[PDB]
C-alpha cells in the first residue's frame, strides 16, 4: 500500500522501507526489513551494506551498531518489494534488541535516535531515520503532617491530551490554615551516560480552616502548548523535524522519562503519585 523510498543524489542506491516507527512490544520489536535496489554498474566489485544505528547524543555514544551485507546476500513485504524490482533488489533484515532506549529527545537532536544507513563500498549513502516507540498497555497517597492530606488518581495510565483527575481530601485538625493548593505535574527526565520539570500547575486559593474537611476533584492536563519554552523538556521522536508530543513514560542506559503528580498544600505537607503517559495503540 505505502512504502518509504530514499536514495542518494546519484540515485544509484534506493532503500524501500515498510514502516518508520517500530512499536516496542517489550518482547518483540517490529523487524526493520527493507529493500536495497542497486544498479549493477555502480557497485561492480564493491559490496552493498546496510547499518542500523542506535546513537545516543547530548558526544556520539553509539549504544549499538549492526551491519547487514545487502550484497552479496547473507518476508512478504520484502517479497512484494523485490518482485517489482527483480534480482538487483536485495533485502535486509535488522532486529532491534528489546533492551534499547526508545526514541526520545529534548526541545532546544539531543537524546536518542535509530537510523538505517545504506552504503556501497568494498569493505566495512541513504540516511533513513526511524524510531522505536511504545503504546499504552490506582494511585493513593496519605501523609499525616495533625494536618491529614490524602490524594488519589482515578487511574494510573492516561493517554496524551487526556486530562487527569485528582481527588483531594484535607482533614485540617491543626491550627494552621491552608493558603493554597497546588496539583502539579512533574516530568523527570534522567540522562544516563535526574532533573525535575513542572509542566502543569492548577494553583487554587482553596483555604481549609482548622478542624475542617475539604474535598473536591481537580483536573490538570499536561500539554505542549505552554511547554514550548522549557529547555531540556523530553519530547518523543522527531522524524525529520516534525512537531512532536511529550516524551512518553519509559517502561523499563539512554534517557529515562517518568511522570508523577504532586499535591502540595501551601501552609508544607505534600504527596506524589506516578502516572503513565503513552499514546494508545490506534
Amino acid at each position, epitope marked *: 500500500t505505502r512504502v518509504f523510498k530514499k536514495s542518494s543524489p546519484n540515485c544509484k542506491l534506493t532503500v524501500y522501507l515498510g*514502516k518508520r*516507527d517500530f*512499536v516496542d512490544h517489550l518482547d518483540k520489536v517490529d523487524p526493520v526489513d527493507g529493500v536495497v535496489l542497486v544498479d549493477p554498474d555502480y557497485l561492480k566489485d564493491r559490496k552493498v551494506f546496510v547499518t542500523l544505528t542506535c546513537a545516543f547524543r547530548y558526544f556520539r555514544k553509539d549504544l549499538f551498531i549492526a551491519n547487514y551485507q545487502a550484497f552479496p546476500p547473507t518476508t512478504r513485504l520484502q517479497e512484494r518489494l523485490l518482485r517489482k524490482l527483480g534480482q538487483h533488489a536485495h533485502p535486509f533484515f535488522f532486529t532491534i534488541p528489546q533492551n534499547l532506549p526508545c526514541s526520545v529527545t529534548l526541545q532546544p537532536a539531543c537524546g536518542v535516535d535509530f537510523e538505517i544507513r545504506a552504503f556501497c563500498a568494498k569493505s566495512l549513502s541513504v540516511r533513513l531515520v526511524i524510531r522505536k*516507540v511504545q*503504546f499504552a498497555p490506582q494511585p493513593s497517597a496519605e501523609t499525616t503532617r495533625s494536618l491529614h492530606l490524602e490524594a488519589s488518581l482515578d487511574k494510573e495510565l492516561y*493517554y*496524551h*491530551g*487526556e*486530562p487527569l483527575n485528582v481527588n483531594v481530601h484535607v482533614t485540617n485538625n491543626s491550627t494552621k490554615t491552608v493558603k493554597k493548593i497546588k496539583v502539579s505535574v512533574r516530568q523527570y527526565a534522567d540522562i544516563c551516560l535526574q532533573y525535575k520539570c513542572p509542566v502543569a500547575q492548577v494553583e487554587q486559593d482553596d483555604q481549609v480552616s482548622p478542624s475542617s474537611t475539604f474535598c473536591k476533584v481537580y*483536573t490538570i*492536563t499536561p*500539554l*505542549l*502548548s*505552554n511547554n*514550548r519554552e522549557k529547555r531540556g523538556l523530553a519530547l*518523543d521522536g522527531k522524524l525529520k523535524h*516534525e*512537531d*512532536t*508530543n511529550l516524551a512518553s513514560s519509559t517502561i523499563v542506559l539512554g534517557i529515562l522519562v517518568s511522570y508523577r503528580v504532586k499535591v502540595k498544600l501551601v501552609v508544607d505537607v505534600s504527596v506524589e503519585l506516578p502516572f503513565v503517559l503513552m*499514546h494508545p495503540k*490506534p
Partner: antibody, heavy 129, light 108 residues
Framework: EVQLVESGGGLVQPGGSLRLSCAAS????????IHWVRQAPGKGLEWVAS????????YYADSVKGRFTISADTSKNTAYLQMNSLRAEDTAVYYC??????????????????????WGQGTLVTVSS | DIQMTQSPSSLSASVGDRVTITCRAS??????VAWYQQKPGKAPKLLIY???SLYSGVPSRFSGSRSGTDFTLTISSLQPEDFATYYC?????????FGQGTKVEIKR
C-alpha cells in the same frame, strides 16, 4: 461514539458580539484539531477558524482574523469561539467539526489538518440592526 | 490561498446516472481533498479523504480519484437519495478552502 454539540446561537446587532461553545463527547480537545466552519444563507461552506490545544496552534481565516478568536477548555472538553464585531455578512449557520490527530499509526500527525469527519448540528447566527 | 475551483456549477441526472464533478486546485495539492455531500439545510457529511479514500460509512457507489491537481468525484448509480450539494475541500494548507457547490438536481 463521537459527537459535537454547538450552542450559543441568537440575534445580535451589527458590531455586537457572541460566543459559541462546541462541547465534544467521545474525544478530547487536546487530541483533535477543532474547526469552526460556517455556511451563509444559501451559499457554500467557508472555513472560519481551527485550533489544536496540545500544541496551542491557532488558525484564522483571512476574513475572520481579529474579529473572531478561538480557544478551548480541556477541563470541560469544549471549544469556545468568541465572535467580535459581528456584521450582517457574518450571518450564517455555524458548524463545528473535528479532525482526529490519531491514525498516524502511532501518534499525533501535527501536519495533516485533515478532513473534518464529525460535524455538530450547526447553530444559526444572525446579525441585524 | 488555493482557489479550489469546481465544475460544473450544477448538473442534472435521474436514477442510475453517473455524475462526474471535477475539483481543480489553483496550486499543487498532495492528495488532501474531501467531498462533503451537504443535504439541503443539514450539516455537511464527509465522503472522501486522502483524495481517494472512501470515508467510513459512505456507500460504495461514491468514489473519488486524482489525475494531478484535478481531482474527480464519481457516482456509479446516482440513487434518488444522492441529491444534495457536493463541496470539495483541500485540507493541505491554511486557511482551508472549499469548492463552490454543484447541486445534483432531478430531471424531467
Amino acid at each position: 461514539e463521537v459527537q459535537l454539540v454547538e450552542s450559543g446561537g441568537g440575534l445580535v446587532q451589527p458590531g455586537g458580539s457572541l460566543r459559541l461553545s462546541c462541547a465534544a463527547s467521545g474525544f478530547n480537545v487536546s487530541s483533535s484539531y477543532i474547526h469552526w466552519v460556517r455556511q451563509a444563507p444559501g451559499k457554500g461552506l467557508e472555513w472560519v477558524a481551527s485550533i489544536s490545544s496540545y500544541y496551542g496552534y491557532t488558525y484564522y481565516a483571512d476574513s475572520v482574523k481579529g474579529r473572531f478568536t478561538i480557544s478551548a477548555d480541556t477541563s470541560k472538553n469544549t471549544a469556545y469561539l468568541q465572535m467580535n464585531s459581528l456584521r450582517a455578512e457574518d450571518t450564517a449557520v455555524y458548524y463545528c467539526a473535528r479532525k482526529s490527530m490519531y491514525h498516524r499509526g502511532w501518534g499525533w500527525l501535527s501536519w495533516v489538518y485533515g478532513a473534518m469527519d464529525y460535524w455538530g448540528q450547526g447553530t444559526l447566527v444572525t446579525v441585524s440592526s | 490561498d488555493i482557489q479550489m475551483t469546481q465544475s460544473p456549477s450544477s448538473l442534472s441526472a435521474s436514477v442510475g446516472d453517473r455524475v462526474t464533478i471535477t475539483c481543480r486546485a489553483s496550486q499543487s495539492v498532495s492528495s488532501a481533498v474531501a467531498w462533503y455531500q451537504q443535504k439541503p439545510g443539514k450539516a455537511p457529511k464527509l465522503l472522501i479523504y486522502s483524495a481517494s479514500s472512501l470515508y467510513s460509512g459512505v456507500p460504495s457507489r461514491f468514489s473519488g480519484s486524482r489525475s494531478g491537481t484535478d481531482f474527480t468525484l464519481t457516482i456509479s448509480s446516482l440513487q434518488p437519495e444522492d441529491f444534495a450539494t457536493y463541496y470539495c475541500q483541500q485540507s493541505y494548507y491554511y486557511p482551508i478552502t472549499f469548492g463552490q457547490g454543484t447541486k445534483v438536481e432531478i430531471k424531467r
